[PDB]
Amino acid sequence: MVDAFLGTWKLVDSKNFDDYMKSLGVGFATRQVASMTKPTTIIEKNGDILTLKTHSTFKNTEISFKLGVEFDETTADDRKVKSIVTLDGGKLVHLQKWDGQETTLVRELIDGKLILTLTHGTAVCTRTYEKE
Numbered sequence: 429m430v431d432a433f434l435g436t437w438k439l440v441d442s443k444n445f446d447d448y449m450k451s452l453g454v455g456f457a458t459r460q461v462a463s464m465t466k467p468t469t470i471i472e473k474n475g476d477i478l479t480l481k482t483h484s485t486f487k488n489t490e491i492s493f494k495l496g497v498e499f500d501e502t503t504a505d506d507r508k509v510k511s512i513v514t515l516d517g518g519k520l521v522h523l524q525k526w527d528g529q530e531t532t533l534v535r536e537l538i539d540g541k542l543i544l545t546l547t548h549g550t551a552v553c554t555r556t557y558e559k560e
């Protein structure tokens with residue numbers, strides 16, 4: 429179901445992450461470092477619990493969730509959000525809600541690569557991850 433997403437992934441391409449971060453109000457100094465960061469994403473399962481790690485020199489995050497069950501999340505840019513991750517047309521769809529705002533983080537496997545699409549307001553960022 430989710431098994432195609434599991435493993436270790438490395439960022440190989442990023443389009444419009446600055447625009448996405450600006451839309452969320454991230455400060456120019458964090459955007460500057462984020463533009464040169466190439467995270468490792470690790471996705472693991474233990475029964476119905478997923479754990480998604482994002483590792484880099486300058487920043488690390490870790491979340492654990494059950495698909496379709498809301499969880500509290502503190503994002504890399506320090507937003508306290510209400511999150512839900514669901515399997516939708518074989519995509520992992522992560523919806524974050526806070527202060528009446530919404531962003532989606534969609535993960536889709538295309539040609540063996542994990543495509544992460546980030547949407548907030550009108551901003552759309554596409555990050556390509558490749559298997560380690």
Ligand SMILES: O=C(O)CCCOc1ccccc1-c1cc(-c2ccccc2)n(-c2ccc(Br)cc2)n1
Pocket residue numbers: 439449452454458461462465467469482483484486487488489503504505544546555
């Ligand atoms: O997984 C992805 O490729 C992006 C997921 C959506 O991430 C963000 C969404 C909105 C605002 C900021 C970010 C973000 C993510 C990271 C990050 C990078 C590596 C490891 C962990 C986190 N950001 C970051 C990088 C460096 C510094 Br200093 C501070 C933050 N910013």
Ligand SMILES: O=S([O-])[O-]
Pocket residue numbers: 434435436437558559560
């Ligand atoms: O662990 S790699 O196959 O994503």
Ligand SMILES: O=S([O-])[O-]
Pocket residue numbers: 439440441466
């Ligand atoms: O562009 S390199 O980081 O894949």
